[PDB]
Amino acid sequence: CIYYKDGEALKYX
């Protein structure tokens, strides 16, 4: 699953 956490941004699921 998603779980971004970088690039002055983030995301998950």
> Residue 3's Cα: distance from chain center in Å?
4
**Alpha-carbon gap, residue 6 to 13, rounded angstroms:** 15
Taking a C-beta distance cutoff of 8 angstroms, is the pair 12, 1 a contact? yes
Cα atoms found within 13 Å of the Cα of residue 11, Cβ hemisphere only: 5
**Alpha-carbon gap, residue 6 to 1, rounded angstroms:** 16
Task: Region of 9 please: left (phi>0), alpha (psi -120 to 50) or beta.
Answer: beta
Amino acid at 7: G
Taking a C-beta distance cutoff of 8 angstroms, is the pair 11, 4 a contact? yes
Amino acid at 13: X
| 3-state helix, strand and coil shares in percent for the chain, rounded to the nearest 5 | 0, 30, 70
Please report which residue ranges of the chain form alpha helices under DSSP H: none
